[PDB]
Amino acid sequence: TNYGTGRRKTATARVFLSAGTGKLVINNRTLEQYFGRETARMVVRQPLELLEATEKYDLYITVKGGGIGGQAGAIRHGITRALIAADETLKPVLRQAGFVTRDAREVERKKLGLRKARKRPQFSKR
Amino acid sequence: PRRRVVAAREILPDPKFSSQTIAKFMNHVMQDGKKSIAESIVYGALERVQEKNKVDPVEFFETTLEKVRPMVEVKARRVGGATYQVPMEVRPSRRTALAMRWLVDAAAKRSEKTMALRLAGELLDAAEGKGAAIKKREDVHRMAEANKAFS
Amino acid sequence: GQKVHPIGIRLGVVKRHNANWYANPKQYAEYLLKDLQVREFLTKKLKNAMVSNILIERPSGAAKVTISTARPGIVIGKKGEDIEKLQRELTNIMGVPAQVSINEIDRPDLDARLVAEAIASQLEKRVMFRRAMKRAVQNTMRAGAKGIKVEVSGRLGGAEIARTEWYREGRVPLHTLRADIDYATMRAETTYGTIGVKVWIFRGEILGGMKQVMN
Amino acid sequence: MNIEIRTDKNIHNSERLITYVRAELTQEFQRHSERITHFSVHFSDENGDKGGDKDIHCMIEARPSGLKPVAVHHKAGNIDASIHGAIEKLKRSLEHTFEKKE
Amino acid sequence: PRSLKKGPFVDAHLFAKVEAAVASNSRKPIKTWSRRSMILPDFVGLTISVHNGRNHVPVIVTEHMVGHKLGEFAPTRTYRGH
Amino acid sequence: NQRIRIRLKSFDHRLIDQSAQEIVETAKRTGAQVCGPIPMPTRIERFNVLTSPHVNKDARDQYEIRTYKRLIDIVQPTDKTVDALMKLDLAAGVDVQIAL
Amino acid sequence: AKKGMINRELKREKTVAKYAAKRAELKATIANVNASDEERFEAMLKLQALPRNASPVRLRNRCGLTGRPHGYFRKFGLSRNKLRDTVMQGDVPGVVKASW
RNA sequence: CUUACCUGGCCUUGACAUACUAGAAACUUUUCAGAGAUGGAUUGGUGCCUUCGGGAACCUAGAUACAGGUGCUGCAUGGCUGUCGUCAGCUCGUGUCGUGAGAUGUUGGGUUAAGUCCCGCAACGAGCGCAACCCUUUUCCUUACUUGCCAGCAUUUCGGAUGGGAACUUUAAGGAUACUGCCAGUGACAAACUGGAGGAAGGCGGGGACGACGUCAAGUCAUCAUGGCCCUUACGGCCAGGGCUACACACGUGCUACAAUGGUCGGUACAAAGGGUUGCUACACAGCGAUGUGAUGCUAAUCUCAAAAAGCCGAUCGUAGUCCGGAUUGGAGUCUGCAACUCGACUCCAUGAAGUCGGAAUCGCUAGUAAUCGCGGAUCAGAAUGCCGCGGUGAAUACGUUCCCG
Ligand SMILES: [Mg+2]
Ligand SMILES: [Mg+2]
Ligand SMILES: [Mg+2]
Ligand SMILES: [Mg+2]
Ligand SMILES: [Mg+2]
Ligand SMILES: [Mg+2]
Ligand SMILES: [Mg+2]
Ligand SMILES: [Mg+2]
Ligand SMILES: [Mg+2]
Ligand SMILES: [Mg+2]
Ligand SMILES: [Mg+2]
Ligand SMILES: [Mg+2]
Ligand SMILES: [Mg+2]
Ligand SMILES: [Mg+2]
Ligand SMILES: [Mg+2]
Ligand SMILES: [Mg+2]
Structure with missing residues (x-):
């Protein structure tokens, strides 16, 4: 019913939220099936345990791009924005948590004359 | 640096025990960004140590950490062309960091089959009071005690 | 030390390229080589006419050269015969026929x-x-x-x-x-x-x- | 200390020159020993295929254990003269640096 | 190695010289520059001089050599030791 | 049922946008309905060119060329619309493909 | 490059153009299954007997303006030395400096 | 081949330009000699314009100026490039001061990343540098509904597949936003600096291009141009083989390992950027495999390269030179190519080297960075551990400037 968009490290998540028993689906899959790593599940779940109203909502989630951590961050951001859209009074607590902010860190490009973005070849003085 | 005051980053609490201290310890254990294997190692060690005696793993870890934390260190001061190792107090963050580094290095130099087993052995040894981290704590106390004379 | 080309640094900023046409990846090299050939020919031909710019355009199956000259009289010709020879040479150089235009510099x-x-x-x-x-x-x-x-x-x-x-x-x-x-x-x-x-x-x-x- | 000597096309180099340069340089700088780990000398002729009073450039660069690498140049009319001038300048520079750092 | 389906490679002029030699009975060496040809089974018993860069070296072809290339018996470098 | 597909390729997005705007305006004058312009992924081609004549590997110039594509459809076209599209002039730098 | 180098390149290209048709026909005969084994062998012999310069593998790309055999950059057809000059004069359409 | 080097066989107005004379369309089919360059035979056509009595193309033959040079000089140069060094500086006009070289301005206080800014002052004014204008990334709005997308509907051989929709993701142009804007403090009541509210983002948000006046007779006559010297039946030109890959040794930059934070086997998830008609190729068969045959869709947000790998779940290995490591060698093959001997890439069977963590010394890096994991491209018939890009997981530590350097 209430929609949210989340973004993190090339990953984008579309989140639909509607009052329900506590269902949670990701790409026609469950949280345990999609994320085999516990940190990702914890990150996905933080926003709704933060309000102590985890099982009073139902979520329908799609995600594309990035890796497991980026997708988890995007899903959490989408859930946070969906909550803010649903209720205005949620935004101060969610921001105090820090979920309202959108992380802008991204990979830095390789550079001419350098092995990597910052790393440069060896200059021996033996 | 010569300017600015860089702020500290935030380490999220671990999944199982929700401990920032345990998360920082996992970060010390981690290599090449393999944090999942880091958590596996740390949790296996914690289960192994819990098996020996029935206590809270978090409480055991923090007690052993307090056992192993340093008190006093010297920082080399170059005046008059001499070392002049001067004892000084150290901030809690440095205390915790050196304690964790000593624990992990001692575990690495132990001689069990797996990192989890040897980390658990090191935690037990530190709890008892005889270990390589305990020896480094003793040595730093000994040296800062020999050089107490200077301010 | 060394310095970037003053024109080279402003192609997409305040200046335009001296060539305006589209080519598929295969005919691009041929088009570029023939444009260079026609520029080399024009530079030698119009040495004494005080020419400033050459704009080569390929609209469709044809060519359009715009020559910026301080002395349009020499390039145009007294009776206009010179421009005919110029377009003939341009059509010989480029497969499709070329049309010349003159921009007077005041x-x-x-x-x-x-x-x-x-x-x-x-x-x-x-x-x-x-x-x-x-x-x-x-x-x-x-x-x-x-x-x-x-x-x-x-x-x-x-x-x-x-x-x-x-x-x-x-x-x-x-x-x-x-x-x-x-x-x-x-x-x-x-x-x-x-x-x-x-x-x-x-x-x-x-x-x-x-x-x-x-x- | 390991010695790595190089010339240019004009100068002309040989293993005989390598042996002689290594021997002389070690003999002169034998006192420092462990203080220094690497020498590299380089020889050029500037206006190759012509002549002049100097017309040849010698360089020696040495790495002292600890402090940063230090370099010396000299110009002379002959390879031997260039080498001798560079050796003298290196000796003076190293003496000054070691006296400074004590 | 050359694919079997293509078959062995031999130069036309060398092949023709070899057939002339075998059809006749003459032991005069066959001078050639084709180091890239293969020693066919019909080459046995013939003397073939192969260019090695500055001179032609003789090779008396025996049953062992079949399958090697001609150049494998005419080394091109002169090294005697350091 | 006839539908006309129009594909524009250029090296200058401003020129290609001008061309597409002119095409849609021409269609509107005739009175047909048109979908677009639809942006299509831009191609980028990047090249590294040494700037020193003889030896400096780290001193280079990095150049790029971009290909911009635009898509247009015109549906329910009339005999006057098609003749207007054919009559319309073409500017350089924008290669236009018309498919029936 | 030298004019002799350029002329050698040109004659090689001319020979390849001359013998392309026969070379292709012989290769097709070689790759044809329904053809007889003796015919395939004869095709192989003729292909091996063709002149060497007919083989496209013996052609080297060259700048065209200068004939340099390195840094060719197929798309433009110019070696880096002249490509940089032509680009930074503004005579190559669509090419600009890259910053991303 | 590239190729500029060497052995040998060859040509001399030259492989390429202009100028003079004469004959021939240009071209075209076959063999013969030879390593080839070359030479000697042998077929078919006789074209395009003409005040047709002569001309354009493209050859042949002779003659003379000449061509030709990757031959020397970067210390005779143009153009281009490195470095001090993105260091914050470097200079002029009018005035003044001093016999003059010269000085001021550009110095003094705070301050900034900065000759950045505010106060004073025989200085008043300017220019080149700093910053800004340019590209990319983070939030949102409008236009656009394709080939790309699937929230509400329905049909489904349950595959957005279908009828459909224009919501969302995305795609790619144009706009908005962030200015110490507002609050509480500090400082001369100046610049400016701290702590806060709001916001996706708060005090240059993060990267990229952009190289001041000048320095080193710094680098490049071998990209190219060019003054001056040199060779002219050879220092020019064509060709076949060989070499640039040699091997008592010494250095620089890398890749792979020395294992259990791991190796092997089975199952199972999640990318971004590029390439494809002389090419990428779904799918079936044959093969242990590299591959081959048939065949399909693609000039591409449509078909394809394409399998992402680290990761997660299950089993074994249980500290051994090992079920670690994969150099070297012996057999058997595939492919590209006229041709893999010198001297190619890859596949299978067998073999199983040094290595068990590396002297003195010394290098890179302050955050989506280091470390680690895989993917693409230019060059290119084939031939990357190199170079240029892309994304996945993801740290440690900064008390401080005392001693180290510039
Ligand atoms: Mg990376
Ligand atoms: Mg990027
Ligand atoms: Mg010089
Ligand atoms: Mg074999
Ligand atoms: Mg030349
Ligand atoms: Mg090639
Ligand atoms: Mg060769
Ligand atoms: Mg110079
Ligand atoms: Mg030189
Ligand atoms: Mg700037
Ligand atoms: Mg030279
Ligand atoms: Mg050769
Ligand atoms: Mg080499
Ligand atoms: Mg193994
Ligand atoms: Mg051993
Ligand atoms: Mg290749």
Whole structure:
């Protein structure tokens, strides 16, 4: 019913939220099936345990791009924005948590004359 | 640096025990960004140590950490062309960091089959009071005690 | 140290390319080589007509060369016969037929290329280099440029030791990408070798970006 | 200390020159020993295929254990003269640096 | 190695010289520059001089050599020791 | 049922946008309905060119060329619309493909 | 490059153009299954007997303006030395400096 | 081949330009000699314009100026490039001061990343540098509904597949936003600096281009141009083989390992950027495999390269020179190419080297960075551990400037 968009490290998540028993689906899959790593599940779940109203909502989630951590961050951001859209009074607590902010860190490009973005070849003085 | 005051980053609490201290310890254990294997190692060690005696793993870890934390260190001061190792107090963050580094290095130099087993052995040894981290704590106390004379 | 090409740094900013056509990845090389050939031909043919720019365009199965000249009379021809020969040569060079157009230059002393050729002519005829430099600078500033800069390097006066000498007046903000700077280079072949001439002319700051240029 | 000597096309180099340079340089700088780990000398002729009073450039660059690498140049009319000038300048420079750092 | 389906490679002129030699009975060496040809089974018992860069070296072809290329018996470098 | 597909390729997005705007305006004058312009992924081609004549590997110039594509459909076209599209002139730098 | 080098390149291209058709026909005969084994062998012999310069593998790309055999950059057809000059004069359409 | 080097066989107005004379369309089919360059035979056509009595193309033959040079000089040069060094500086006009070289301005206080800014002052004014204008990334709005997308509907051989929709993701142009804007403090009541509210983002948000006046007779006559010297039946030109890959040794930059934070086997998830018509190829068969045959869709947000790998779940290995490591060698093959001997890439069977963590010394890096994991491209018939890009997981530590350097 209430929609949210989340973004993190090339990953984008579309989140639909509607009052329900506590269902949670990701790409026609469950949280345990999609994320085999516990940190990702914890990150996905933080926003709704933060309000102590985890099982009073139902979520329908799609995600594309990035890796497991980026997708988890995007899903959490989408859930946070969906909550803010649903209720205005949620935004101060969610921001105090820090979920309202959108992380802008991204990979830095390789550079001419350098092995990597910052790393440069060896200059021996033996 | 010569300017600015860089702020500290935030380490999220671990999944199982929700401990920032345990998360920082996992970060010390981690290599090449393999944090999942880091958590596996740390949790296996914690289960192994819990098996020996029935206590809270978090409480055991923090007690052993307090056992192993340093008190006093010297920082080399170059005046008059001499070392002049001067004892000084150290901030809690440095205390915790050196304690964790000593624990992990001692575990690495132990001689069990797996990192989890040897980390658990090191935690037990530190709890008892005889270990390589305990020896480094003793040595730093000994040296800062020999050089107490200077301010 | 070294410096970026004043035109090269502003292609998509305040300037436009000297060639405007589209090609598929296969015919691109042929088009570029033939454009270079036609430019080489025109430079030799119109040496004495004070030509400033050549714009090569391929609209569709045809060609369009726009020649910017201070002396349109010579290129046009007294009775217009010269333009027919020019288009014939262009159609011979390029597979599709080419049409020529002429842009008359009414303020030649604001064009960097023309100034460089003028200085190079005197330098080849053995006039004093810092006489020609000052004459060109004064003429351009009288024309109205906000600034001009001239550089001459080589064996000036026949000296065994080569050297470089320059003179600047007004404003030449090279680091400002929104500034109209015209850059030109020319060569003078004297009995004692080559002398290089560089000219910069500044025509104020362009406003509104490439949209104002109507790209 | 390991010695790595190089010349240019004009100068002309040989293993005999390598042995002689290594021997002389070690003999002169034998005192420092462990203080220094690497020498590299380089030889050039500037206006190759012509002549002059100097017309040859010698360089020696040495790495002292600890402090940063230090370099010395000399110009002379002959390879032997260039080498001797560079050796003298290196000796003076190293003496000054070691006296400074004590 | 050359694919079997293509078959062995031999130069036309060398092949023709070999057939002339075998059809006749003459032991005069066959001078050639084709180091890239293969020693066919019909080459046995013939003397073939192969260019090695500055001179032609003889090779008396025996049953062992079949399958090698001609150049494998005419080394091109002169090294005697350091 | 006839539908006309129009594909524009250029090296200058401003020129290609001008061309597409002119095409849609021409269609509107005739009175047909048109979908677009639809942006299509831009191609980028990047090249590394050494700037020193002899030896400096780290001193280079990095150049790029971009290909911009635009898509247009015109549906329910009339005999006057098609003739207007054919009559319309073409500017350089924008290669236009018309498919029936 | 030298004019002799350029002329050698040109004659090689001319020979390849001359013999392309026969070379292709012989290769097709070689790759044809329904053809007889003796015919395939004869095709192989003729292909091996063709002149060497007919083989496209013996052609080297060259700048065209200068004939340099390195840094060719197929798309433009110019070696880096002249490509940089032509680009930064503004005579190559669509090419600009890259910053991303 | 590239190729500029060497052995040998060859040509001399030259492989390429202009100028003079004469005959021939240009071209075209076959063999013969030879390593080839070359030479000697042998077929078919006789074209395009003409005040047709002569001309354009493209050859042949002779003659003379000449061509030709990757031959020397970067210390005779143009053009281009490195470095001090994105260091914050470097200079002019009018005035003044001093016999003059010269000085001021550009110095003094705070301050900034900065000759950045505010106060004073025989200085008043300017230019080149700093910053800004340019590209990219983070939030949102409008236009656009394709080939790309699927929230509400329905049909489904349950595959957005279908009828459909224009919501969302995305795609790619144009706009908005962030200015110490507001609050509480500090400082001369100046610049400016701290702590806060709001916001996706708060005090240059993070990267990229952009190289001041000048320095080192710094680098490049072998990209190219060019003054001056040199060779002219050879220092020019064509060709076949060989070499640039040699091997008592010494250095620089890398890749792979020395294992259990791991190796092997089975199952199972999640990318971004590029390439494809002389090419990428779904799918079936044959093969242990590299591959081959048939065949399909693609000039591409449509078909394809394509399998992402680290990761997660299950089993074994249980500290051994090992179920670690994969150099070297012996057999058997595939492919590209006229041709893999010198001297190619890859596949299978067998073999199983040094290595068990590396002297003195010394290098890179302050955050989506280091470390680690895989993917693409230019060059290119084939031939990357190199170079240029892309994304996945993801740290440690900064008390401080005392001693180290610039
Ligand atoms: Mg990376
Ligand atoms: Mg990027
Ligand atoms: Mg020099
Ligand atoms: Mg084999
Ligand atoms: Mg030449
Ligand atoms: Mg090739
Ligand atoms: Mg060769
Ligand atoms: Mg120089
Ligand atoms: Mg030199
Ligand atoms: Mg700037
Ligand atoms: Mg040279
Ligand atoms: Mg050869
Ligand atoms: Mg080599
Ligand atoms: Mg193994
Ligand atoms: Mg051993
Ligand atoms: Mg390749």
